[PDB]
Design a protein around this motif. Sequence first.
Motif, PDB file in Angstrom:
ATOM      1  N   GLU A 174       0.868  -1.159   0.000  1.00 59.51           N
ATOM      2  CA  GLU A 174       0.000   0.000   0.000  1.00 59.51           C
ATOM      3  C   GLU A 174       0.923   1.232   0.000  1.00 59.51           C
ATOM      4  O   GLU A 174       0.922   2.018  -0.950  1.00 59.51           O
ATOM      5  N   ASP A 175       1.725   1.379   1.056  1.00 57.89           N
ATOM      6  CA  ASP A 175       2.674   2.495   1.176  1.00 57.89           C
ATOM      7  C   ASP A 175       3.392   2.674  -0.138  1.00 57.89           C
ATOM      8  O   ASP A 175       3.642   3.797  -0.577  1.00 57.89           O
ATOM      9  N   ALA A 176       3.709   1.544  -0.761  1.00 60.45           N
ATOM     10  CA  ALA A 176       4.452   1.511  -2.015  1.00 60.45           C
ATOM     11  C   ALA A 176       3.712   1.967  -3.276  1.00 60.45           C
ATOM     12  O   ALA A 176       4.349   2.244  -4.293  1.00 60.45           O
ATOM     13  N   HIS A 177       2.384   2.052  -3.214  1.00 59.37           N
ATOM     14  CA  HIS A 177       1.582   2.466  -4.370  1.00 59.37           C
ATOM     15  C   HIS A 177       1.444   1.319  -5.360  1.00 59.37           C
ATOM     16  O   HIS A 177       1.849   1.430  -6.520  1.00 59.37           O
ATOM     17  N   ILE A 178       0.878   0.213  -4.895  1.00 62.88           N
ATOM     18  CA  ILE A 178       0.682  -0.951  -5.744  1.00 62.88           C
ATOM     19  C   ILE A 178      -0.807  -1.149  -5.947  1.00 62.88           C
ATOM     20  O   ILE A 178      -1.530  -1.520  -5.017  1.00 62.88           O
ATOM     21  N   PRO A 179      -1.290  -0.901  -7.173  1.00 56.86           N
ATOM     22  CA  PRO A 179      -2.706  -1.042  -7.536  1.00 56.86           C
ATOM     23  C   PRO A 179      -3.378  -2.280  -6.955  1.00 56.86           C
ATOM     24  O   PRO A 179      -2.771  -3.354  -6.887  1.00 56.86           O
ATOM     25  N   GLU A 180      -4.630  -2.128  -6.533  1.00 56.10           N
ATOM     26  CA  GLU A 180      -5.394  -3.247  -5.994  1.00 56.10           C
ATOM     27  C   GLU A 180      -5.574  -4.254  -7.133  1.00 56.10           C
ATOM     28  O   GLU A 180      -5.700  -5.451  -6.909  1.00 56.10           O
ATOM     29  N   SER A 181      -5.563  -3.752  -8.358  1.00 61.19           N
ATOM     30  CA  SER A 181      -5.723  -4.599  -9.518  1.00 61.19           C
ATOM     31  C   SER A 181      -4.516  -5.486  -9.700  1.00 61.19           C
ATOM     32  O   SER A 181      -4.415  -6.186 -10.711  1.00 61.19           O
ATOM     33  N   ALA A 182      -3.597  -5.453  -8.739  1.00 62.38           N
ATOM     34  CA  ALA A 182      -2.386  -6.263  -8.827  1.00 62.38           C
ATOM     35  C   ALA A 182      -2.157  -7.092  -7.578  1.00 62.38           C
ATOM     36  O   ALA A 182      -1.303  -7.983  -7.562  1.00 62.38           O
ATOM     37  N   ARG A 183      -2.925  -6.800  -6.536  1.00 62.74           N
ATOM     38  CA  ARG A 183      -2.806  -7.509  -5.272  1.00 62.74           C
ATOM     39  C   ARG A 183      -4.162  -8.021  -4.808  1.00 62.74           C
ATOM     40  O   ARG A 183      -4.509  -7.896  -3.633  1.00 62.74           O
ATOM     41  N   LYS A 184      -4.917  -8.616  -5.729  1.00 62.57           N
ATOM     42  CA  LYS A 184      -6.248  -9.123  -5.417  1.00 62.57           C
ATOM     43  C   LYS A 184      -6.271 -10.497  -4.754  1.00 62.57           C
ATOM     44  O   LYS A 184      -7.048 -10.721  -3.820  1.00 62.57           O
TER      45      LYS A 184
END
Length: 305
Positions: A264-274
């Motif tokens: 999250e802190d890192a700015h990783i799209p939810e579309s990539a960590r589902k």
Amino acid sequence: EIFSQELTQREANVKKVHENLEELQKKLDHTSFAHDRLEAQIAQKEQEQKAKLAEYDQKVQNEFDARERAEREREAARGDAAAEKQRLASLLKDLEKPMLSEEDTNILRQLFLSSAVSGSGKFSFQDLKQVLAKYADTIPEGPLKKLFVMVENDTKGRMSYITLVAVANDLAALVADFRKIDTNSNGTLSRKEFREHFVRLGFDKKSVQDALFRYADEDESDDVGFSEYVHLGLCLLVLRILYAFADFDKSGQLSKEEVQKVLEDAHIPESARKKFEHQFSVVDVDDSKSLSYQEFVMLVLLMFH
Ligand SMILES: [Ca+2]
Ligand SMILES: [Ca+2]
Ligand SMILES: [Ca+2]
Ligand SMILES: [Ca+2]
């Protein structure tokens, strides 16, 4: 194994500054939103750390330099002083990929081609920041490149502290001289050697080892060459620094909430960590519900590679 008070002294005090700031902010974090100096002091005890870590980082580099030279000597003292000058240049050639300059190449020569850092108990963000810099590109845009640049941007020097003070002893153990790994002296680590080396860094799971080998070995040959080793090497350091940056409760091992706030802190799209939730469990092999460095490592890979 770098026994030198000038440094020990330096590490001890910088800690005081951090243990201060740490404790200082602890307050702000739970003082009713009543009518900020803390916010002031925080910011204040924060620049000092940088300045202190900055001075400390250079004393570390100087030691490594002396250590490397002091090692090249010993080598000559033994066999052919040129029968070795070559190996390094032959190996160092495999980086011939990003824009690695003499400067950076030497940094890699020290990290991955000598025991100057390997188990010295010290590590420098400054050297690590420089290399990752000219390596991100190589990495296509996406999640893994974000984890990478999160370590480089060094926000508030929080990364700088973890590298130099907090987990330096651990960062130096993940590093090693390729020539010692390569137990048969051909420029490529075999599947056997690879394993054998990585089994002694906390990777006893076959499932995870093949994961690493599959990560490093890009041109897809059952062999690993110094250049890929260096690639896998920089990835482990990076994730190793993030593993601690994410242990907000200092319990020793990351947990769902914690891992989540980093991606999250890192700015990783939810579309990539589902499938994230499902994977965490997959990786969490001892069911502790937390993740060990080896698991956080499997995770990252699984999800983004
Ligand atoms: Ca070999
Ligand atoms: Ca290969
Ligand atoms: Ca934790
Ligand atoms: Ca676990």
